[PDB]
């Protein structure tokens, strides 16, 4: 891999995210760092409105522009959703709408909190000389006390990071195909399958650190966007940047490059067809950092691993390829259970059968990719 | 340039020397496609499609023959769905055509509807193999109705596409010249691109000689229409034997052409950036291009901006050659709003404000990318 901004240790995650901004931006930071109390005290929306319009030019390197997107994005959510009880600001005040929209266009990202913000750039080690485990980690920002944002953002991050180990193998999959090294290719594919199986174990932790009522009734309200959203039917007004209100989708692991990445590698045509599922996953690429968009595109422009395997009459290679597919199926199947516990059952205790149909469509397109 | 992008040096995105005949095994497909005018006009087309035996696609071996069969099955499918051209529609595609069509469509990563890469890029032959790519020496392979002007519409579209080919082969020169910091080479390349883009506009003028407005608007447009937001098939079309429910797909559009999306990307004209409708349409139409070609587009998006590099140099020669590329795009799109007036607006006078707002947004986004035209 080259300049796809892919890290050997953490993959698509941002390595060691900047934790502080230049002092030129303490006003941003003081708000973003105290959202739990400012929302609860009812002070937050007024503070945002009293802000002055700071420039983005004192954000020079990539990590600092990413910390800013995260800071502005969490503030925009808190402002738009308030205490999360349904009272909704339909106008983003231009003293924050304008720098957010500008810095966004600089990074070729939409002006709304995005997976690459609140997961990929939203973490820190407690001890730098200890490893990347949950206990040694923490998030940079939360929305409200008890919103379980640390657990949900870090478990998503740990799964993301577990999948990084499979990523560095991808080059040697394509080298083996081109130089016709059947043994090297088999090894690489068994290695990928091993890493996706480990990502599954990691997924288990979600039950320890996230509670269904807290996620469904609080965290999910703050992660929501304004694209086909009834409480903002026309989108949000970015005052002083766009004439009219604009629609943008809310955060989604659909925006994780890492799962899209392996569908591509294995020739699982998830973005194929005109279905809803294919359309959603294609659209979510626009919410990824452009380096990672570029990376998916170049995977797609490679010879098909699945075609190479199918043409060899080689049960060894077929079973290693199938081990990869199976691991993806396993993750999506475990993942459907989590949605039952964390969205379906909480929602019945207050439809979203469209939600399970999207995931089951993705799952079975993977199932159908099994060779034998 | 990478030859896995399926771009030919002479003919560009078009399929070079398309196949005209399928194996004898497919004669029943081929008879219906060669005689769509005769079979539609005599109310016999639907019956012959319904009398077809389900044939395996497995004997379609090389890429050229699968493209021909997609063209054959796409033309037949449009004839079946639309019929004589006046509202008698079929909403179910019979399994014996729907299944091979969809197997071949999935094998080639195109949706199972007739698409620009079928009816333009693969729908042509040279009359005389030893003479140039000129209208007089070319024919299409398939038409829908006598006097539907499909020869003129498809071949002008194709000759514009081939004209724009001579600029595409210059594209690697642009990216290595920015890399190697070679100002003179970059300036020659940009000028060469703009020149090809201006020659493409002259080729565009031939449309008036071979395409009659009534013919296009009341006939050809009918058979090229899709089933996505079309009230006549409000739920789409049932590919009986292949999917249980009716799937929706958009009809052919030069939005599906890689060439004009191609140069907008190269020049950092962000037709696709945003969340507006024009951007969404141009993004979606990428799904109706051959896969090698959507690969080519998004890999251009991966390179560093030419606009930015030219802006960072204080070099009026470079800015002018860059601007000569953008202006050639504005002239194509402006001349193109001219003929959409002649072939859609004034025939629909004897609701359609959507296409005119789409083309002006795309034209406007190009005009605003200029570095200088006060
Ligand atoms: C309480 C925990 C979780 C909930 C409620 C949840 C919910 C959902 C839902 C409803 C979807 C459907 C698409 C959408 O509507 O956005 C989805 C998609 C997805 N989720 Fe989750 N999720 C959870 C945990 C996770 C975690 C921790 C990951 C780790 C990366 C993950 C990975 C994915 C992926 C990759 C997709 C895209 C569909 C696919 O590629 O299979 N999920 N999620
Ligand atoms: C009678 C002739 C023509 C008619 C009636 C016509 C009509 C239209 C219409 C209505 C649109 C709007 C998008 C849509 O609704 O599909 C469009 C877009 C477009 N057309 Fe045409 N067109 C004609 C000839 C051509 C030809 C010959 C070319 C090039 C070979 C061309 C290139 C394009 C392109 C590239 C777009 C997408 C927007 C852009 O990039 O400019 N058109 N056309
Ligand atoms: Cl914002 C964020 C961060 C990390 C992971 C995920 C996720 C996990 N499964 N799908 N998406 C998201 C989107 C969170 C979300 C999902 C469903 C309803 C409301 C919100
Ligand atoms: Cl099918 C085909 C082939 C070559 C060029 C074009 C075209 C040219 N301008 N826009 N699209 C098309 C689509 C033709 C079409 C245009 C408007 C309504 C219905 C159909």
Author numbering:
A (entry chain B): 12 to 361, 380 to 401
B (entry chain A): 11 to 360, 380 to 403
Task: Kindly provide excerpts from the paper associated with this entry.
The haem enzyme indoleamine 2,3-dioxygenase 1 (IDO1) catalyses the rate-limiting step in the kynurenine pathway of tryptophan metabolism and plays an essential role in immunity, neuronal function, and ageing. Expression of IDO1 in cancer cells results in the suppression of an immune response, and therefore IDO1 inhibitors have been developed for use in anti-cancer immunotherapy. L-Trp catabolism along the kynurenine pathway is an important mechanism employed by cancer cells to escape a potentially effective immune response. Type i inhibitors (e.g. 1-methyl-L-tryptophan) preferentially bind to oxygen-bound holoIDO1, type ii inhibitors (e.g. epacadostat) to free ferrous holoIDO1, type iii inhibitors (e.g. navoximod) to free ferric holoIDO1, and type iv inhibitors (e.g. linrodostat) to apoIDO1.
